[model samples]
Target: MIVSMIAALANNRVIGLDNKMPWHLPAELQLFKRATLGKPIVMGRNTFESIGRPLPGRLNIVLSTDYQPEGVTVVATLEDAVVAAGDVEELMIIGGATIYNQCLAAADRLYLTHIELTTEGDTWFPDYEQYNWQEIEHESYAADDKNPHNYRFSLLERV
Candidate 1:
């Protein structure tokens, strides 16, 4: 199966603040849904809690050592999470910072949405520049009335 990731990162590499992103971008949300829908998405407990509940149209797999929530499969390690995903063609890794760090090396594709603003946050996306990535697609957008952040959707493949 193809192991991949999906994240919305800030200019400072911040993926979340107070368990949420620093800004809102409706377009980015739509993009995320399109990419991950019907796929098995693996995330840390923090990430799952931040999202409130199991996301619709996808199999929610969470890796957590301390607690478990209803309606999703829980695993203690990435290995188990991958197993829980079954025989899917692609496994989607969604994350809290910790889970991203653990799964980065195994990722074959990355769907990273760049938010061109920076702010302090408790968690940050793992540094991805050290890996060789080839940009496969990019679409940039300006801030609009509904979505107040300048953002770009990018697709990358590890090379």
Candidate 2:
């Protein structure tokens, strides 16, 4: 299976604060939904709770021993989550920092949006320097009245 991760972070790499995203970018959410729709999405328990329900049009696999919510599958380990998605050709790891770190080493592709501004946050995307990722596609978006900051969407693959 091709394991991939999708995330949007500020220039400082801050992804979350107080268990919630620090920014409210509707465009970013649309991009994420478009990329992950109809795919199996794996996330940590906290990330699942943050969303409050299983996202429609996708299979939700949560990583946690304590979470047994309806309409989603819960597994204790990352490997189990991967196995649950094995029938698919691609799997999207959508997460909090902890789950991102767990799946980073195995991820073959990354879909990231780089926000131009920085913001204080309690959680961050895991360090990616260890992986030799090659940028394959990019599209930049300027900030408008609706969106608060400029951002660029990038797709990368392991080289």
Candidate 3:
């Protein structure tokens, strides 16, 4: 199975603050939906609560405590989340921070949106420098009417 992760972060690796993303990028939002549509997406409880709704067109698995929201599958462990995805060829790991760190080492591929601008946030993407990755595909976009910041979408593989 290909354990894939999808994330959008600032240059400083800040993913969120106060349980919310620091910026809004419609481009990245669309990209997020496109990549995860029809897939099993694993996320932490905070990530799910942050969004406050179950995303449509994908199986939402949240590694949560006793909290169970309607239309979401809640599990206590990351491994439990993976096994719940069933016999899928590709598994998508969405995150809030903690879950990302737990699953980072097992990730086979990354669909990362590198926001050119840096911002401050309480949450950050894990320190991923230990693993060597090769960006096999990349596309860059400039700030426009919808997207406020310059960004690059990169598909990386642990090679």
For each candidate in the order shown, give its overall lDDT on alpha carbons: 0.87, 0.87, 0.87
Q: Model 2 over residues 2-73: C-alpha lDDT tens digits?
A: 899999989767898787787867899889998999999998877888798999999999888555799798
Question: Model 2: how far is 102 from its true place, Å?
Answer: 1.5
List TM-scores for all candidates, in order: 0.90, 0.93, 0.92
Which runs in model 1 stand beyond 4 Å of their true positions?
Answer: 65-68
Q: How many backbone clashes does candidate 1 have?
A: 0
Put down candidate 3 lDDT per residue, 29-122, tens digits, no spaces.
Answer: 8889989999999887777877889898999988875586987998887678778888888889988688788889999998999998878789
Please report the TM-score between candidate 2 and the true structure: 0.93
lDDT of 2: 0.87
By summed lDDT, the worst window of 10 consecutive residues in model 2 runs over 62-71
Cα displacement (Å) at residue 35, model 1: 0.9
